[PDB]
Design a protein around this nucleic acid. Structure first.
Ligand SMILES: [Mg+2]
Ligand SMILES: [Mg+2]
Ligand SMILES: [Mg+2]
Ligand SMILES: [Mg+2]
Ligand SMILES: [Mg+2]
Ligand SMILES: [Mg+2]
Ligand SMILES: [Mg+2]
Ligand SMILES: [Mg+2]
Ligand SMILES: [Mg+2]
Ligand SMILES: [Mg+2]
Ligand SMILES: [Mg+2]
Ligand SMILES: [Mg+2]
Ligand SMILES: [Mg+2]
Ligand SMILES: [Mg+2]
Ligand SMILES: [Mg+2]
Ligand SMILES: [Mg+2]
Ligand SMILES: [Mg+2]
Ligand SMILES: [Mg+2]
Ligand SMILES: [Mg+2]
Ligand SMILES: [Mg+2]
Ligand SMILES: [Mg+2]
Ligand SMILES: [Mg+2]
Ligand SMILES: [Mg+2]
Ligand SMILES: [Mg+2]
Ligand SMILES: [Mg+2]
Ligand SMILES: [Mg+2]
Ligand SMILES: [Mg+2]
Ligand SMILES: [Mg+2]
Ligand SMILES: [Mg+2]
Ligand SMILES: [Mg+2]
Ligand SMILES: [Mg+2]
Ligand SMILES: [Mg+2]
Ligand SMILES: [Mg+2]
Ligand SMILES: [Mg+2]
Ligand SMILES: [Mg+2]
Ligand SMILES: [Mg+2]
Ligand SMILES: [Mg+2]
Ligand SMILES: [Mg+2]
Ligand SMILES: [Mg+2]
Ligand SMILES: [Mg+2]
Lengths: 116, 87, 101, 70
RNA sequence: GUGGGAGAGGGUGGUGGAAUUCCCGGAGUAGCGGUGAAAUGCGCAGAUACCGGGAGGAACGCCGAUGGCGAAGGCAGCCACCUGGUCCACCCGUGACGCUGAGGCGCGAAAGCGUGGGGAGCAAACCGGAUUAGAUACCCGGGUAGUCCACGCCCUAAACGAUGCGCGCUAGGUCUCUGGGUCUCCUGGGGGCCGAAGCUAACGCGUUAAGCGCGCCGCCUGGGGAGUACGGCCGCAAGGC
């Protein structure tokens, strides 16, 4: 209900899921969407389809919240991490800056044994 | 460190004649100075083995030049020793 | 003694009496710890890369010194205790390596 | 796709305090450039390294930044 | 001796950013996580995703290498301090002062023990979840010792180049690290690759010998039994020789 009209769009992708968060330019969220937000259940969540579906969905939501100008931040490198951005470009919102933020350590933390 | 005139004191002090930087006298004083400084560092910094090793090799040096002096010129060796207090 | 460089970096929102007092206290610290001034270059106000103390920028002084040995570290502990100095670095001087010359 | 020290002044490598030059060797993210793309030598590069990290500690140069496009 | 140099060699003090976790705060719902697919697990006491603030511990991305240092184990953020080794140039000084080294003596990854500290992530044992002939094993979710620090033990290993140290001889080419030079090139010292002669059962090695020689040490004598048994020494123990 705020009537916002410009803001941050975060994509987040693991190979297990995708999550979009629309947010306002000082960082507070507006709405969000995910793989299971749309009814998708299992492994089916880490597809590019649901990536699309979710982007479109959160975009839709905020677009009814009044969103227009949207500048993107992608964290994570994953399955259809692309298809999510590739979707919400064609959402009708206007993608302003696409930025890749996938956060990486300077080597601090011993990783789960899966991971090396 | 061991600075330069910090060395010159010693070299000019144990010289056999003007200009000698190389004889057993000079060599053993120089060496022995280096030795005592290290013992000073290794008093604290007990934890440093990689310096300690080098100090072993160093006293082994000293000792070898000494066996040289002794076997070759006994008086000058008793002189050098009672000069440095050691052995 | 030995040839050192000091960098000091402070909070840019300091007024004149403040920045004065800071500088004075740095001087009185160098004196007090044995260090002498070879020269000064203070570039002052500039915009950093990452925020230091929530601040987008900072105020830089550069002081090239000569001083005793052991004392250096303790001197920079005295510098660092300051609340408006958000950073200090020291180095021994180096010869100006000219590369691609 | 030119090297760095190819177009550049012939300059002090061991100076951290000066950014204007030092930056020219970092990517869009803070990453210090590899040899192939820096152009310099092993002792050079080894020194460029230490200088950069020194300045990164003075906040003059960045530790890392964000990647645009994508 | 003097002049110069490279280095993640060691030690003590300090300090910087990313990241994980956790606590506080805001905004915001219905899921998150995880797999081959799942489930346990966590989420309305408000998770995940997001923005700000704090606490703490460990480890230092890019540079980074087919690279460097070290006797070996081994050594990567940055700054300072204490320090070992080593290379080159000058041809100055001593005058065989050398090599090797049974025995001793000391250092020696990881794990393990002892007494204190500490504890983010990981994680034997362990508690659970699906697989599915069956987990008690691989896959998933928890998790304690341990991992870290100080002090004292332990002395092992594919501790490997499976190649003991030292010196002298014996084509070259090529790639590189680091000094010196009159700097297309030359000349020392490291690290690789191809290859003369030569060696080798073959593979292969070949101025970084596995070539030609000398010196000194260690070691070997079919496989199993068996690195066991007895004894001795060391060790709190586990255990080691
Ligand atoms: Mg999934
Ligand atoms: Mg658009
Ligand atoms: Mg080091
Ligand atoms: Mg919260
Ligand atoms: Mg449910
Ligand atoms: Mg429940
Ligand atoms: Mg935070
Ligand atoms: Mg805590
Ligand atoms: Mg690498
Ligand atoms: Mg090794
Ligand atoms: Mg040194
Ligand atoms: Mg001569
Ligand atoms: Mg003569
Ligand atoms: Mg022995
Ligand atoms: Mg051990
Ligand atoms: Mg251990
Ligand atoms: Mg036990
Ligand atoms: Mg313990
Ligand atoms: Mg875990
Ligand atoms: Mg089962
Ligand atoms: Mg587990
Ligand atoms: Mg091997
Ligand atoms: Mg063996
Ligand atoms: Mg061996
Ligand atoms: Mg032999
Ligand atoms: Mg050369
Ligand atoms: Mg040259
Ligand atoms: Mg060579
Ligand atoms: Mg060669
Ligand atoms: Mg070959
Ligand atoms: Mg032949
Ligand atoms: Mg033969
Ligand atoms: Mg053959
Ligand atoms: Mg040989
Ligand atoms: Mg052979
Ligand atoms: Mg038999
Ligand atoms: Mg045994
Ligand atoms: Mg027995
Ligand atoms: Mg007993
Ligand atoms: Mg055993």
């Amino acid at each position: 209900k705020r009537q916002v009209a410009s803001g941050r769009a975060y994509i987040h992708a693991s190979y297990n899921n995708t999550i979009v968060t629309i947010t306002d330019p000082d960082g507070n969220p507006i709405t969000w969407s995910s793989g299971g937000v749309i009814g998708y259940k299992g492994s089916r969540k880490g597809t590019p389809y649901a990536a699309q579906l979710a982007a479109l969905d959160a975009a839709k939501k905020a677009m009814a919240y009044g969103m227009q100008s949207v500048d993107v931040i992608v964290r994570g490198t994953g399955a259809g991490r692309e298809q999510a951005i590739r979707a919400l470009q064609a959402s009708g919102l206007q993608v302003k800056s696409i930025v890749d933020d996938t956060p990486v350590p300077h080597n601090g933390c011993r990783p789960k044994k899966k991971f090396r | 460190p061991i600075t330069k005139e910090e060395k010159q004191k010693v070299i000019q002090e144990f010289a056999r004649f003007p200009g000698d930087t190389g004889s057993t006298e000079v060599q053993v004083a120089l060496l022995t100075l280096r030795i005592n400084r290290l013992s000073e560092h290794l008093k604290v910094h007990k934890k440093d083995h990689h310096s300690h090793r080098g100090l072993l090799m160093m006293v082994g040096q000293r000792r070898r030049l000494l066996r040289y002096l002794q076997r070759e010129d006994p008086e000058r060796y008793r002189a050098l020793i009672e000069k440095l207090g050691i052995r | 003694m030995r040839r050192y460089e000091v960098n000091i970096v402070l909070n840019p929102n300091l007024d004149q009496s403040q920045l004065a007092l800071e500088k004075e206290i740095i001087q009185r610290a160098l004196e007090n710890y044995g260090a002498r001034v070879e020269k000064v270059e203070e570039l002052g106000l500039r915009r950093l890369a990452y925020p230091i103390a929530k601040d987008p920028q900072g105020y830089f002084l550069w002081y090239q010194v000569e001083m005793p040995e052991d004392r250096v570290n303790d001197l920079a502990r005295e510098l660092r205790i300051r609340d408006n100095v958000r950073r200090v670095m020291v180095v021994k001087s180096q010869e100006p390596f000219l590369a691609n010359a | 796709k030119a090297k760095v020290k190819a177009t550049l002044g012939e300059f002090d490598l061991r100076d951290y305090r000066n950014v204007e030059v030092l930056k020219r060797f970092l990517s869009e993210t803070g990453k210090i450039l590899p040899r192939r793309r820096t152009g310099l030598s092993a002792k050079e590069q080894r020194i460029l390294a230490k200088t950069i990290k020194r300045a990164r500690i003075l906040g003059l140069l960045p530790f890392t930044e964000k990647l645009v496009r994508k």
